[PDB]
Structure 1
Amino acid sequence: KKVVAVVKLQLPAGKATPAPPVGPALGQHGANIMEFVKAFNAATANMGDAIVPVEITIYADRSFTFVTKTPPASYLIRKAAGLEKGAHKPGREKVGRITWEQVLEIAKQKMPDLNTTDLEAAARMIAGSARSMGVEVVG
């Protein structure tokens, strides 16, 4: 009979085992902890990878409730520029490239997560996040 909690997790895709942080902060739910292996890898089994964020709430008769966001800035851009990884040293070696209008459509994937609700504002976020990794933007 443990308290009403507001839990916030970050686990990736696949590894859906009931070990921390899926254990101590999640015992307070009486959670169907393994109902996430199946209620998560059902929106991410056509995809496969991608960390998909999650918030897990419990009430007073011991059941759990979770809702997810959309795959990372760094993630979306990696499989549009022919890449598995980033660029080791951001600066002197670009290991991919992306046009002004492929970042916008990536910026259109992340539109309902952000601070602004725009496209020119949003795509410069994608643009700054390409400098963060060292992939030149095809301008």
Structure 2
Amino acid sequence: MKKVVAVVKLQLPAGAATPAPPVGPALGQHGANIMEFVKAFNAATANMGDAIVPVEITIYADRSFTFVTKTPPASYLI
């Protein structure tokens, strides 16, 4: 059972995830692999230029995680 322990909501500049805050403390709090997220997020958003990327990180009870990125916020593109 993929039991969820947290849903972390961030907004990061595309390709600009780092192990510093916010990602460091946010994922670190729940024991999730910070660098795996950084690498995966940056790869997934690599062709998005300077867009602001909302991302939701779902962290499971065994420290594994998945994430989903959303469409740039209304304000931005508005």
Residues 93-136 of structure 1: CA distance to partner in whole angstroms, max 9, x if unpaired? xxxxxxxxxxxxxxxxxxxxxxxxxxxxxxxxxxxxxxxxxxxx
Rounded to whole Å, the distance in 1 between the matches of 2:3 and 2:21 is 18
Match of 1:58 in 2: 59
Cα separation, 1, equivalents of 2:25 and 2:42: 22
1:17 aligns to 2:18 (yes or no): yes
TM norm structure 2 = 0.70
Rg comparison, structure with higher value: 1
TM-score, normalised by the number of residues in structure 1: 0.45
RMSD: 3.1
> Aligned runs of 1:92-107 on 2, under 5 Å?
none
Gaps of 5+ in 2: none
In the other structure, the counterpart of 1:42 is: 43
Contact 1:32 1:63 in 2 (8 A): yes
Unaligned runs of 5+ in 1: 78-139
Query: Looking at both structures, which has the greater relative contact order when contacts are Cα pairs under 8 Å and sequence separation is at least 6?
Result: 2
Q: 1:50 to 1:24 in 2, by over 3 A?
A: same
Change (3 A) 1:3 1:38: closer
Q: How many residues align?
A: 77
For 2:73 and 2:57, how far apart are their aligned partners in 1? 20
Q: Identify the structure with the greater strand proportion.
A: 2
